[PDB]
Structure formats: C-alpha cells, structure tokens
Design an enzyme around this catalytic site. Structure first.
Site, PDB file in Angstrom:
ATOM      1  N   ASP A   1       8.408   0.141   0.841  1.00  0.00           N
ATOM      2  CA  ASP A   1       9.186  -0.891   1.524  1.00  0.00           C
ATOM      3  C   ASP A   1       9.823  -0.267   2.772  1.00  0.00           C
ATOM      4  O   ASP A   1      10.781   0.511   2.662  1.00  0.00           O
ATOM      5  CB  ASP A   1      10.277  -1.490   0.623  1.00  0.00           C
ATOM      6  CG  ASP A   1       9.744  -2.125  -0.714  1.00  0.00           C
ATOM      7  OD1 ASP A   1       8.528  -2.108  -1.026  1.00  0.00           O
ATOM      8  OD2 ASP A   1      10.592  -2.687  -1.459  1.00  0.00           O
TER       9      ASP A   1
ATOM     10  N   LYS B   1       9.904  -8.834   3.074  1.00  0.00           N
ATOM     11  CA  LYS B   1      11.008  -8.681   2.146  1.00  0.00           C
ATOM     12  C   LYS B   1      12.306  -9.015   2.873  1.00  0.00           C
ATOM     13  O   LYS B   1      12.503  -8.593   4.018  1.00  0.00           O
ATOM     14  CB  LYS B   1      11.012  -7.249   1.605  1.00  0.00           C
ATOM     15  CG  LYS B   1      12.161  -6.881   0.706  1.00  0.00           C
ATOM     16  CD  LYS B   1      11.957  -5.468   0.125  1.00  0.00           C
ATOM     17  CE  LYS B   1      13.248  -4.990  -0.529  1.00  0.00           C
ATOM     18  NZ  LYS B   1      13.261  -3.632  -1.124  1.00  0.00           N
TER      19      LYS B   1
ATOM     20  N   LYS C   1       9.172 -11.198  -1.009  1.00  0.00           N
ATOM     21  CA  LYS C   1      10.110 -10.521  -1.898  1.00  0.00           C
ATOM     22  C   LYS C   1      11.529 -10.914  -1.527  1.00  0.00           C
ATOM     23  O   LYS C   1      11.947 -10.720  -0.377  1.00  0.00           O
ATOM     24  CB  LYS C   1       9.957  -9.004  -1.823  1.00  0.00           C
ATOM     25  CG  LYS C   1      10.972  -8.242  -2.732  1.00  0.00           C
ATOM     26  CD  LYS C   1      10.601  -6.796  -2.904  1.00  0.00           C
ATOM     27  CE  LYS C   1      11.667  -6.061  -3.702  1.00  0.00           C
ATOM     28  NZ  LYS C   1      11.438  -4.568  -3.780  1.00  0.00           N
TER      29      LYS C   1
END
Length: 247
Positions: free
Chosen positions: A99, A164, A198
């Site tokens: 990430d 995300k 996400k």
C-alpha cells in the site's frame, strides 16, 4: 447483519490496535487474523515485520492470509526514488501486497505527473514480483470531490490494483461519500475487473461495515466485492463484527 459481518470480516486487512510494532504484537496479530468464524483477508504490518509474520501465519496453517504492508507512508512525499526503494524492499521482505501513499500534497499543488510517475514506478516493481499495489490517495486530506476523483483516476491510469481511502493516521479517513466517489471512478473508467477498493477507517461498527459494502453492491454486482476488489483496513472493527456474529 450476520451475513454482511461475516462477509466484511473475510475482506479485512487487519492491523494492530494502537499501532503496536513489536514482534510479539505482530505475532499476536497473526493469531487474531485466524478468527473463530474464519480468516481475515490479510494483515497490515510494517515491512520489517513481514518475515516473522510470514513464519507465524505458516505455522498456524493459514498461508492464505495475505501480508500487506505500506510504503511512502504515511507522508506521501513526492520523491519517487524513495517510494520505489521502499516498495522494492517491501517486495524483498516478502510482501503479498504493498500500500503506497500517493503524493497527494503535490497533486493539491497542481503536480499530477509525479503521482502518475510514482505509482507507475511502484506498480512495475510489484507486478514483476506478482505483488498487488494498493494506492492510498488520502481522501481525507484531498477533501474536495474533484481532487478525490482526480487522485483515483491518476492512480488507476498509472496501474493501481486497488485505490485505498486513507493511511488511518490523519484526522479524516474514509467516509461514505469518499468511498462512493472512489468506487464511482472505478465504474466510470470501466476498470472494475482490474481495480479494487479499500476503505480505511470510517467503518467502526458492524452496521458501518454493512453500509460500506452496500455501496459496492449497488455500483457493481452483489458478487463484485470479493477479496481482489474490496478490503476493510481496520482494527477495532474486527471486534464489532465478531460480536455481531455471536463471538
């Protein structure tokens, strides 16, 4: 609410409660991911914890709990060489997923190109190693809907496998509105097969988790939000889900 809670649990990227970083807390996190009712999708840890976490998960017989980590984190600075070096180290430690924080401050100052280049560089490293790249755009700092769309579009065009919402370390993380904006970008660009979403933060309760998933169910099939396309980045949310499930 038991179906959505079990569903959300199996989509969880689980991290430690108070940002604990010790080897024992990471080991305990691995144990926590093997819940009474099933395994979370992943655990989220810093890169140096990957080798001990990988050992721990294998020894408990759960190799399918993915190991996710973070790079360029949480600052989202605009130095590509640093983000790329951290990502290559995360891969080499053994990450399943990385990430990376999008350089959102640079984007806010009008530099879209560095975010494209940084994500592309990290994606190429991850893809060559069969590692998934999630891109944290930090929607709570972008704040403006058009900036959230913009960061999402750039990340997708640069090769993000997930977008995300948040690092979890700023004042505002995911909201139902930013989640909808980001999932709308995935739909509007036609990349639902290749790009997942996400939510980090936002969902505190099982009722929150249900509502976040319903957005994905509305925009895409009710079948779309599997582990490749949907994650909850959460800690305390796991306890709320388990309680809803009678544990």
């Amino acid at each position: 609410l038991k179906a959505s809670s079990l569903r959300a649990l199996k989509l969880m990227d689980l991290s430690t409660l108070n940002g604990d970083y010790t080897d024992e807390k990471v080991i305990a996190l691995c144990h926590q991911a093997k819940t009474p009712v099933g395994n979370t999708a992943a655990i989220s840890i810093y890169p140096r914890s990957i080798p001990i976490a990988r050992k721990t998960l294998k020894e408990q017989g759960t190799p399918e709990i993915r190991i996710a980590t973070v790079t360029n984190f949480p600052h989202g600075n605009d130095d590509i060489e640093i983000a790329l070096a951290e990502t290559r180290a995360a891969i080499a430690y053994g990450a399943d997923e990385v990430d990376v924080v999008f350089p959102y401050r640079a984007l806010m100052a009008g530099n879209e190109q560095v975010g494209f280049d940084l994500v592309k560089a990290c994606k190429e490293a991850c893809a060559a190693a069969n590692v998934l790249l999630k891109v944290i755009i930090e929607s709570g700092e972008l704040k403006d809907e058009a900036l959230i769309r913009k960061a999402s579009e750039i990340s997708i065009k640069a090769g993000a496998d997930f977008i995300k919402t948040s690092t979890g370390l700023v004042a505002v993380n995911a909201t139902p509105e930013s989640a909808r904006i980001m999932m709308e970008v995935i739909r509007d660009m036609g990349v639902e097969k290749s790009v997942g979403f996400k939510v980090t933060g936002g969902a505190r309760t099982a009722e929150d988790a249900q509502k976040y998933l319903a957005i994905a169910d509305e925009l895409f099939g009710a079948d779309w939000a599997d582990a490749r396309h949907y994650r909850f980045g959460a800690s305390g949310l796991l306890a709320s889900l388990l309680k809803a499930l009678g544990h």
